[PDB]
Design a protein around this ligand. Structure first.
Ligand SMILES: CC(=O)N[C@H]1[C@H]([C@H](O)[C@H](O)CO)OC(C(=O)O)=C[C@@H]1N
Length: 512
């Protein structure tokens, strides 16, 4: 597709993907590139660095404060007060000033903007964080953390209990807990009253408490998370921790009876001799319809309609797509139609994998369900492609260099036969080194590099009281932490559907 045909398609990730393929082959001239960032759905990462090689944009500076950005540290005292106050939004700018100019500006702004006064006078010390913490300036605390992570200080009970009322708290808490940074911040957060936190923050404060072996504080935080979390899946994770810590059998009972299918509810069912949850059976009689499952533009179109449809229009779409050929779209519609209530675990293009052993089948299907929901022309924001969501680098390495497929193009990843085949090949590579399907999942999502480095650590997937569950909470990238949990449930389920059951307790033992 040329830049002309693309310009006449709707903005979407597919169209971005194709513009990016033109850019990477140097087929976009400086003239084609004029009208172009209005043809881009998500102007972020490599498509934007590539377009800026051709047309390097300088904007944006808001036209009303333009004059404020003509001053420097050496001339800021010549600027009007509006200009002074705008420039002082930057802690780097404040750090650049000399110390008597910070004193001067601190007085100027003491009545009207004490927040600026506090930062100005804090940067006149050798420890700005210490100064801000003594004022209990909460906005300033978060501005300093974002300026530099290296500041670390003990925080008293009054101060830590104010932090959660600021929007930055949740990312701050998660980030220092899972990265194991800022030990003094971490230790201080033991004294946060569970009444003051909720949802993920509460959860991560329970994980924090466990790392300091404060099991009673942890329980209290996990209990608060269970009460406040919106998603049943997250509640279950919290209820599991409550159970593991204090061993109340009503917690486990509640968890065994969850409507969410996840590793926590699966495990609780297995410990209480509860039957495996009901998996829906989608068996459309109709063979095909008009829809091209190989057209990435048709998928982008129909996805947006599906996601924006009322309860009425979902019924019309469910009927249209109730066919074997469009089975992944049918299931996608039924997941939205039933408000995420029933359990769909389809096995499309099954002929391409029925000859692998059943364990491999289940891992392939588990990965695919998480990666794409089996959509053949799925495209991620980093332009990973097809059912098994291969980055183009890897797809080209396997297809051209290893399998020297005649006339391989990366868009072959949109073919089910190719996706499953390449997925099997890549999963052999990963499983041969990592063994556990959980670790394979982590490596499939985040690379074997990061997986091998996490597994090399002294404190990860070793023996302990609360292992391997604690380690699964401390996987250092949020996306991978979540991916692995999801893929593991899927794997358990697909092993069951294929009459190759395994106990999830065995999976957990093999993690240590
Ligand atoms: C199969 C495959 O290409 N795996 C890759 C992974 C996936 O592309 C990702 O989970 C799909 O969204 O991303 C990344 C990544 O670092 O973004 C690396 C993995 N090698």
């Amino acid at each position: 597709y040329s830049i002309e045909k693309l310009k006449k398609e709707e903005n979407s990730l597919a169209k971005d993907y194709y513009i990016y393929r033109l850019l990477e082959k140097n087929k976009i001239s400086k003239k084609d590139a004029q009208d172009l960032n209005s043809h881009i759905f998500r102007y972020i990462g490599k498509i934007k660095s590539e377009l800026e090689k051709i047309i390097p944009l300088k904007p944006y500076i808001n036209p009303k404060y333009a004059k404020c950005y003509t001053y420097t540290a050496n001339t800021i005292l010549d600027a009007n007060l509006t200009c002074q106050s705008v420039r002082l939004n930057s802690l780097v700018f404040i750090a650049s000033l000399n110390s008597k100019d910070r004193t001067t500006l601190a007085q100027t702004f003491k009545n009207q903007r004490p927040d600026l006064t506090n930062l100005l006078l804090a940067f006149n010390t050798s420890d700005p964080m210490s100064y801000i913490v003594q004022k209990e300036d909460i906005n300033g605390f978060f501005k300093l953390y974002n300026y530099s992570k290296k500041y670390d200080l003990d925080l008293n009970t009054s101060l830590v209990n104010k932090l959660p009322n600021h929007i930055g708290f949740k990312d701050f808490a998660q980030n220092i807990i899972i990265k194991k940074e800022n030990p003094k911040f971490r230790h201080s957060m033991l004294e946060i009253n569970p009444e003051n936190v909720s949802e993920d923050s509460a959860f991560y404060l329970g994980v924090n408490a466990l790392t300091y072996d404060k099991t009673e504080l942890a329980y209290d935080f996990f209990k608060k998370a269970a009460q406040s979390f919106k998603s049943q899946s997250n509640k279950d994770n919290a209820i599991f921790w409550m159970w593991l810590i204090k061993n109340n059998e009503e917690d486990l009972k509640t968890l065994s009876q969850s409507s969410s299918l996840n590793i926590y509810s699966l495990y609780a069912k297995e410990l209480t001799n509860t039957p495996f949850p009901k998996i829906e059976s989608l068996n459309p009689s109709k063979k095909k319809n008009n829809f091209n499952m190989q057209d990435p533009f048709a998928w982008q179109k129909i996805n947006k309609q599906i996601r924006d449809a009322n309860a009425s229009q979902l019924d019309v779409l469910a009927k249209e797509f109730d066919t074997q050929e469009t089975l992944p779209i049918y299931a996608y519609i039924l997941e939205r139609k039933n408000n995420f209530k029933k359990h769909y675990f389809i096995m499309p293009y099954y002929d391409n994998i029925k000859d692998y052993n059943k364990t491999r089948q289940a891992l392939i299907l588990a990965i695919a369900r998480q990666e794409s929901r089996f959509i053949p022309t799925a495209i991620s924001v980093s332009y990973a492609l097809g059912m098994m969501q291969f980055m183009p680098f890897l797809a080209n390495h396997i297809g051209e260099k290893e399998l020297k497929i005649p006339n391989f193009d990366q868009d072959f990843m949109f073919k089910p036969e190719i996706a499953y085949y390449f997925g099997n090949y890549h999963l052999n590579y990963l499983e041969s080194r990592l063994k556990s399907p959980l670790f394979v999942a982590y490596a499939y999502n985040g690379g074997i590099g990061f997986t091998n480095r996490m597994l090399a650590r002294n404190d990860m997937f070793k023996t302990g009281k609360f292992e391997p569950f604690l380690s699964m909470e401390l996987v250092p990238y949020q996306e991978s932490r979540i991916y692995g949990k999801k893929v593991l449930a899927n794997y358990i389920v697909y092993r069951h559907l294929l009459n190759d059951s395994i106990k999830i307790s065995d999976i957990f033992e093999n993690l240590i």
